[PDB]
Symmetry: C3
Subunit: 113 residues, 3 copies
Amino acid sequence: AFIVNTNVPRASVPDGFLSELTQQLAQATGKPPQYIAVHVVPDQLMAFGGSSEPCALCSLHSIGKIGGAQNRSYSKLLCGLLAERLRISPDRVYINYYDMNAANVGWNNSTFA
Amino acid sequence: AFIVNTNVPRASVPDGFLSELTQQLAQATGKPPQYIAVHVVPDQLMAFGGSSEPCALCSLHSIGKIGGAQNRSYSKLLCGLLAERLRISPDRVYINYYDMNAANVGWNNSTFA
Amino acid sequence: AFIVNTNVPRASVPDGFLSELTQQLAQATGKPPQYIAVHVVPDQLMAFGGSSEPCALCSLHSIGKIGGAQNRSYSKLLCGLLAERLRISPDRVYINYYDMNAANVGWNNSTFA
């Protein structure tokens, strides 16, 4: 799943943003879009560097598809999207990447193990 | 702690839901309910598989009590509650499990180490 | 980043709270305040020990500066702030500490690796 928490207001999140994230992450990770879950949380009380200018804190959790070169590529993609769509400067974005073990991901009454 | 983020609206979360999560997680983990913390976040902007049908993204963090068989059992329990109480299909739920080191959990001005 | 989720209402969060967090975390971790990100989420549906008295579930993610003694010191600091500013008892606070690999933190179109 990909989560974005931001102080940008809800009205500034364009219609279609969750779909675009879904599509671009499917493409970037090489996973079918049926597996991709996205969550956007606007209107947050947040600061970055002490400033309340637009910012984002995000997380990308994946079973595999995480690593040094991949995460550089995801960061370019996702900063690009946040800059274009939400008008958040890339230097005011953090994204934490998490390589999840299949045994530690529940789904459909079981886990992926 | 157990956290559930969902697009299901607040009005659809039944009375008693946090209490029932607390009780059933105490029972499933074998921990006294005094230790259990629960957090439910409805009304979220979320998609799963590109669809906005009811879904959930959840986390369970625990100092121990995490593992292959345990996490399957937690998933059956928790998907069952989400399906019964919130009408979320089990195949539209992800739960990330985290086995926390006691030195990495703060509480009461210190950590559990 | 430091994130606090609480059932305390927004009106009970004092002016200056994000800034005081930012200043005190910079001091505690050594890190320049320009890189510190903070996020406060009030008005949450949460329970701790089955009770809805004020409580908080927090996360602190850092590239390094995490460890047994450091996390104890962060907990004293952060519990003290939550007690003084939000009137939350320290024994109703959990803080999860995460030592992030630089390759798993995206910022400014790249990662910190």
